[PDB]
RNA sequence: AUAUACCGCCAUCUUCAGCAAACCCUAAAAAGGUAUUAAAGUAAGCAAAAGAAUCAAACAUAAAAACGUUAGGUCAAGGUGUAGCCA
């Protein structure tokens, strides 16, 4: 099972008629639906890295 | 235990130069690095008149025995601050010296900010950093001034968040809000090499020192 | 410019 | 019709007027204003004026082991049951104006002060309980603007103080009150002067100085004197810690001036051991309750002087008539000295 | 007043602990009625039972 | 300015769930419909009716679940078949929520002549979609 | 009766680019806060932008357009505050 047999599976399941394809049903690995955040820039003794 | 703690950070106070940053430097080496010429008397600031030997036909020239003096107190007093792992943040606008100075800075193991200085970098640091952002312990300024000739932000900035500043100050700089002024050339480059190399090796010194001091320390507390 | 003065406060009704 | 009714959050939308234009350009001097309530604060789910009891709604499901069934409350439990209810919602009502006093400050229907608590905790919760504000002025100053014509906003004066030597001031402006009030307040803990005081209350010695055009002329008095200085100078030496001191204040009553130049001051004041340091001699204090006794209360810290400080046969102080004056035998107004309460 | 409001607090001459409330540490003065808020009353009272 | 089904800014401390945050513009683009019949359909009978009767079924549950609601309900017709799923909040007991639901079943199916049914998602509290 | 108590739904500048809030700075601040070879401003929301619609693609058209301005319009869409009528 992969990501292109995911996005069809879930566009059977859930059926939405919505224009805008961001506002559809979406079971998306979090990679690509979670904004990649720089970490932490410091440590515990707080020294930046 | 609490022994060995009191004992890595108390003795050290105990010493007048405990580093032994005196062998760094002389006042012959300072005279090869023309760390005592200074700008016509045109541009002369009234605070560093203290520091002036004289007037060489226009050219003001530091008195490079105060500066002796002066530079071992702010060697001395950035020894035992890397001693103790504190923060410390180089600083200059000076663009000809951009990349030395930020080069320096990765060599010591501290920080270097030769950037344009945004408004409130020290003073709304949490703003700007994120919220439990730990400020430099100390500034050490090797241009005092930007390129408008002004005092550099971080100077005002800095005695506002009560942090000490060692900073070198030619004879058109103010040196009153630098903890450790250190009278000196700022333009020439052999002046400007001359003292990141000592801020260099006193750092490298003052953490090899800890990490020497611990293992001794350390070591009796098994044996 | 009546109803800015500490009425509200010093009566307690917060 | 039951499809013309509304619902209560759009109802007293409408009858309070609150978004309406005329409220939000001030066009009203406000009274006996509609003041909102919420309708199903007491109502219980299942309760009617009919009175019918709904088992595993408004009664028990199950009642000594008997499954109960509908019924309805007799016309006197009813009108108990109502009554009681409306006992609960007008114990409510009384409750809604009940309020807690607060103390006044300098005047009833002003601002100056008016303690308004502690400054809020700081970035690692270093809380300031110990910290009390005060208010010094509130000011409605005005900026005229293209689109909104004459803008108000709320400048507000505040010092702070833990009562035990720091105390700090700042200004705090925003377009509402509550906001430059906070503004003020942690702005103050930011800017915190140390005022030295001779044994924890008093100044170390007299103070005359010129901040702008305001004049303060502070005195150092014995315990037992109190404060007898300007309001804003008893507010501010509260903050402080000083309890015994005399000011006189002339020129300018400006709030500002007033308290920069007293802050000026009492920071730049100077110490018997600081002066003990300068000169190398012994400080000595001579108290007339103590006879010729000699008291040292500053010794200098490395070496002691042997040669006496120049005693001039005629000092060339520059004194001041008002204090001269009263030696002279000149009469002292009216307003002088009066009795007043415990400051 | 400070006396009147509490009916419990009572000015006599064996009440030193109150009576001290109302004199100067310092100086050893008794207040004038001014200073602590008392009424005339109770202050020529005060007095009488302080002396 | 257009003042249809719009909520307006504040100061940033208004909190609003996604229906409410969408304007009308945003029907059928980013937010779907409350309730789904075939009335409205090309060549379809009893529009009339079918809206008359969402009005009243949502003035019903709101009354039937004082603030019990934490969202507008949603309506669903197959056959002659009603569908009502609203999220409600956590705030009565158990109990009574099975009470209201028997009630408010027999009492809609015996008003309208068809079989209504009743599906509640109960959330811990409101979900915020922004806060405005 | 009162749109000069209002909700609701709109007009207008307007497809104008601003609005509001939390901070920070000033030899005091009524306010103001930019320089890129950079000199005190900073990090987020709403609008704009983007996106979606006119069933390829673009462009275009629609839609969208904050906060305010005109006590703008509407108590007669409906609802409702205050006052008034109830043979
Ligand atoms: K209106
Ligand atoms: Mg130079
Ligand atoms: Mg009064
Ligand atoms: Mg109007
Ligand atoms: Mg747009
Ligand atoms: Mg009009
Ligand atoms: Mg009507
Ligand atoms: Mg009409
Ligand atoms: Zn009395």
Request: positive net charge; charged residues 25%.
């Amino acid at each position: 099972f992969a990501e292109e047999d995911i996005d069809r599976a879930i566009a059977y399941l859930f059926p939405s008629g919505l224009f805008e394809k961001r506002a559809r049903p979406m079971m998306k690995h979090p990679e690509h639906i979670f904004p990649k955040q720089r970490a932490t820039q410091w440590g515990e003794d707080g020294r930046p890295f | 235990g609490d022994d060995f703690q009191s004992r890595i950070l108390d003795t050290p106070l105990q010493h007048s130069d405990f580093f032994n940053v005196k062998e760094l430097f002389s006042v012959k080496s300072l005279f090869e690095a023309r760390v005592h010429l200074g700008h016509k008397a045109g541009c002369r600031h009234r605070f560093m008149e203290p520091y002036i030997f004289g007037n060489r036909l226009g050219q003001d020239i530091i008195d490079l025995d105060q500066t002796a003096l002066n530079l071992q107190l702010a060697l001395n007093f950035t020894a035992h601050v890397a001693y103790r792992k504190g923060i410390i943040l180089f600083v200059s606008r000076n663009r000809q010296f951009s990349h030395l100075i930020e080069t320096t800075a990765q060599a010591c193991g501290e920080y270097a900010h030769t950037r344009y200085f945004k408004g409130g970098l020290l003073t709304n640091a949490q703003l700007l950093f994120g919220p439990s952002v730990r400020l430099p312990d100390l500034i050490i300024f090797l241009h005092t001034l930007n390129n408008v000739f002004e005092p550099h932000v971080a100077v005002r900035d800095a005695a506002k968040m009560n942090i000490p500043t060692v900073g070198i100050v030619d004879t058109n700089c103010n040196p009153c809000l630098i903890t450790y002024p250190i009278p000196g050339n700022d333009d020439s480059p052999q002046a400007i090499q001359l003292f990141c190399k000592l801020f260099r090796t006193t750092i490298n010194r003052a953490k090899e020192k800890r990490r020497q001091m611990e293992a001794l320390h350390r070591l009796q507390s098994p044996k | 410019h009546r109803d800015a003065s500490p009425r509200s406060f010093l009566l307690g009704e917060e | 019709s039951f499809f013309t009714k509304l619902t209560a959050e759009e109802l007293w939308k409408g009858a309070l007027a609150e978004t309406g234009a005329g409220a939000r350009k001030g066009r009203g001097k406000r009274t006996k204003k509609k003041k909102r309530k919420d309708l199903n604060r007491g109502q219980i789910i299942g309760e009617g004026r009919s009175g019918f009891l709904w088992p595993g709604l408004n009664v028990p499901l199950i009642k000594s082991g008997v499954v109960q069934n509908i019924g309805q409350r007799s016309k006197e439990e009813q009108q108990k049951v109502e009554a009681t209810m409306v006992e609960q919602r007008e114990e409510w009502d009384r409750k809604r104006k009940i309020k807690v006093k607060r103390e006044r400050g300098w005047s009833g229907n002003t601002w100056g002060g008016v303690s308004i608590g502690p400054p809020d905790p700081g970035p690692n919760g270093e809380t300031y309980e110990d910290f009390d504000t005060r208010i010094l002025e509130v000011r409605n100053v005005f900026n005229m603007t293209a689109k909104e014509g004459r803008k108000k906003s709320v400048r507000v004066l505040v010092a702070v103080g833990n009562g035990n030597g720091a105390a700090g001031f700042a200004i705090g402006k925003a377009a509402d009150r509550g906001d430059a009030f906070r503004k003020a307040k942690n702005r103050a803990i930011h800017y915190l002067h140390y005022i030295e005081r001779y044994e924890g209350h008093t100044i170390f010695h007299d103070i005359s100085l010129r901040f702008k055009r305001t004049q303060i002329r502070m005195k150092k008095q014995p315990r037992g004197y109190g404060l007898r200085c300007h309001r804003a100078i008893i507010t501010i030496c509260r903050l402080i810690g000083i309890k015994d001191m005399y000011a006189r204040v002339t020129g300018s009553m400006n709030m500002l001036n007033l308290t920069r130049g007293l802050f000026h001051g009492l920071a730049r004041q100077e110490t018997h051991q600081h002066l003990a340091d300068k000169k190398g001699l012994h400080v000595v204090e001579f108290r007339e309750e103590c006879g010729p006794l000699p008291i040292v209360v500053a010794s200098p810290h490395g070496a002691l002087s042997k040669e006496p400080e120049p005693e001039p046969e005629v000092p060339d102080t520059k004194l001041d008539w008002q204090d001269v004056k009263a030696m002279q035998g000149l009469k002292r107004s009216v307003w002088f000295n009066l009795k007043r309460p415990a400051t | 007043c400070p006396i009147c409001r509490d009916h419990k607090l009572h000015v006599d001459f064996r009440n030193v602990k109150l009576l001290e409330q109302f004199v100067c540490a310092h100086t050893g003065i008794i207040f004038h009625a001014p200073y602590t808020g008392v009424c005339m009353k109770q202050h020529k009272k005060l007095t009488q039972a302080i002396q | 300015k257009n003042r249809a089904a719009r909520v307006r800014v504040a100061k940033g401390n208004k909190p609003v769930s996604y229906e409410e945050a969408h304007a009308p513009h945003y029907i059928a683009h980013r937010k779907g419909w409350l309730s789904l019949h075939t009335g409205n359909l090309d060549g379809e009978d009893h529009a009339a009716e079918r809206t008359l009767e969402d009005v009243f079924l949502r003035k019903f549950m709101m009354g039937t679940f004082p603030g019990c609601l934490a969202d507008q309900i949603v309506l669903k017709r197959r056959a002659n078949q009603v569908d009502i799923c609203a999220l409600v909040l956590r705030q009565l007991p158990a109990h009574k929520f099975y009470f209201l639901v028997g009630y408010s079943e027999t009492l809609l199916s015996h008003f309208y002549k068809c079989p209504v049914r009743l599906h509640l998602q109960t959330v811990p509290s409101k979900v915020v979609y922004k806060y405005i």
